[PDB]
Symmetry: D2
Subunit: 254 residues, 4 copies
């Protein structure tokens, strides 16, 4: 396949949450292949360091990895500030990190609910807070926040996850209004059922394969690279007047 080049992304400073594995890793790789200067946080140290080495080996700018638990807001904001000290002000923020662990209403404790929101919802807000003054100094920027088809499909088996994934649309739309005067675009990206290693290992069974075939309009695997292309579009000059909106990349499910 012959994929796009976005000359406007060369030299841009890009910060990604959860960039070590899964969709995050495809977004890190896609931006580095455009010549962007990427930084990302993850807790998966071995996979993250290997990804950075592989991208450099392929001829692209080595992404800057920092180990950071996104549940620790002070450590996360300190990490973003330290990376801004290395790369300069960020142009692009990608709020990708999540965790889709299943859970039942009747078993969720206060502590578990809090932890689900600390992983899936809170980091996005503090990431925006950490990058906006630099984006104003750079004359604008683009923020991409990840939702999920899970809440669109009324998906069962993880109601705190659906809650957090729907919340992304309110974060996007409130911020689009607040930040638009500074030429900062804020959009939602909503994947379908993406065949990452995690999805194949934990959640995909024969019944899940039959649900994909019934519900997708296009047959075949939705893959991390499909999502990465939409994020590159939304970060590039090509999308300069897109804001507040939801971009669904789902092979026709919802």
């Amino acid at each position: 396949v012959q994929l796009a080049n976005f000359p406007s992304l060369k030299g841009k400073r890009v910060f990604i949450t959860g960039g070590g594995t899964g969709i995050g890793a495809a977004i890190v790789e896609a931006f580095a292949q455009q010549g962007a200067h990427v930084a990302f946080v993850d807790i998966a140290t071995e996979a993250s360091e290997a990804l950075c080495n592989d991208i450099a080996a392929a001829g692209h700018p080595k992404p800057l990895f920092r180990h950071c638990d996104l549940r620790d807001i002070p450590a996360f904001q300190a990490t973003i500030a330290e990376l801004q000290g290395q790369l300069g002000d960020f142009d692009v923020l990608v709020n990708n990190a999540a965790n889709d662990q299943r859970h039942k209403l009747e078993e969720v404790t206060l502590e578990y609910w809090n932890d689900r929101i600390a992983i899936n919802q809170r980091p996005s807000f503090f990431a925006v807070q950490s990058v906006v003054e630099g984006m104003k100094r750079r004359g604008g920027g683009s923020i991409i926040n990840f939702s999920s088809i899970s809440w669109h499909q009324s998906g069962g088996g993880f109601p705190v996850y659906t809650t957090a994934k729907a919340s992304t649309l309110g974060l996007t739309r409130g911020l689009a209004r607040d930040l638009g005067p500074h030429k900062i675009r804020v959009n939602t990206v909503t994947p379908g059922w993406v065949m990452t290693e995690r999805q194949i290992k934990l959640w995909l069974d024969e019944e899940g394969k039959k649900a994909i075939a019934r519900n997708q309009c296009l047959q075949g695997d939705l893959l991390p690279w499909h999502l990465a292309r939409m994020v590159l579009f939304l970060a590039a000059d090509d999308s300069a007047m897109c804001t507040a909106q939801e971009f669904i990349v789902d092979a026709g499910w919802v």
Copy 2:
């Protein structure tokens, strides 16, 4: 005006969050006028006790008020269990309580963000957890969760509020799937700009009046009673096959 009677609501046990003032108080009154046995929590003791006395004086079943800060999940769940001991299992849950205090991205602390979610998002989940076993014993039930046009309009000036208000759609839709086998309906109600005393006192100015007139299709005040009628419909047998959906009562704004 000559408003509906819903014979199916007579004798039903109804729990409402934030029922002492504003839209909550109109929902308490509307259910009591149908002959339902209402219970509600609020922190506004004087207004809440006065509301209960006024409804009894008007000839209806006296609602049971309990003072409870919804930020304290253990106290809130204990309160629901104590009220179930008085009225029996609940048939209807209305997740109404919120707080729309304005705030700027750049000024939000970790503690403030946590408190916004503790008021606007977390109580709804634990309210559902507290009532579902009783609704199964009653052979079904109806859960009504409040969103807001704020996130639909990309409203500025309160991004944690828009985040929490969008999150309601994911709580509704994940739970509709999980609880539907038990004949428990779960729907979202989304008010427009409702002229409560709070809205008139804090947020309404000449510019806000001009925004209402430009954006509403129907001129005039959207009022608490308009929202109460939609909640009664969604709790009554008349709506027995509505679930997962959003009901917007907004005079045509969004």
Copy 3:
């Protein structure tokens, strides 16, 4: 099983398209049970006459039936004017009629496309045109336009039908703005897969029964009366500040 009474509907003048069978017949019955004065058009003469006699035998105001092919706009507008001569100005319009005949892209002729639009889309516009001056004289009114979950599902096998069913949202929303100054409300009602006799006999098989069970959150038949209750609500004073919006009655499918 104890359904609502809407005192505001007693004596109201109600016009319904396609009121002789299916969901339309349930709407005609539901309005007559509230004491409204109903008129409706259909091509199904024997079923329509039988329904009017059954309603009269149940003790309600006998609906006025007129045979009319909605494809004939002049005849249809003349029929509405003649019924306005009998009942007075209409308060409520329900645009219900449709025909969901399946068809394949590659087989649709120009004449077939035009006929599909003549049945499914064009009548609604001219129904509104015919009732609006009377609604202005009555001091307002309520218009209910039927969509379908078909377009929300990306339903295959009838692309001109999905086209016409999505078009309802644009009719509703353009007219909500144009008619709101006259206190005329305009809303969309979107049924799920309603077990009318026609749906069961034309389109239902064992696979369809499995699709209903997988996709509905609430098990059991979505029935004409469920849709009728939503239309009563939207026509009654209880919904006086609902306009422009979509009300989905689908047991949680979409």
Copy 4:
């Protein structure tokens, strides 16, 4: 100002309706700049011939223009077949043509309604019918159908136009399901208020300039080229698993 290159578009055969002026002309230019072989229809002969000469003078493959009134389905389908004879099977279809003439409910005749639908709705269906067998032979393709924020805004003053613009979503979603097995993607593109020459000269006044400033989150003109970039993305291999969805390019209005 350094816009993307999509190598997958070089040599692709692209058919555009209404490609002579406005957004259509920007789409024609953008595809030709990528090295695609473009054909388009319009009624604006002098503007269309000029555009083809300007594109040729810029060094790109010269688009093929044919004069055709899209209201004449047989003539339109014959024109597509003749252009397929010149370029080969089409890979990409862009259903862009429309006409937003204002009109009032009370003044619309049967003939005017039919003409509005003949211009704004019917051509898209027959364009798909004319290109699909070639797209199957090419092993897939991409269809882009234009909606409008007008229906999302509940825009007044043109109810047949809002009807036709909402109808696009049902055309897109029914066909995404029917054509997905052939690897044909079908998506909706929904512009905001795009500052074409026609919009500025017909519809813009000082009030409209204030409405744009209040409603857009990003200040400044939404331009034809912004829409063109979204259409390129949806036609390129980068969007190979996008189907059934709406892509809104509106500077944050709706």
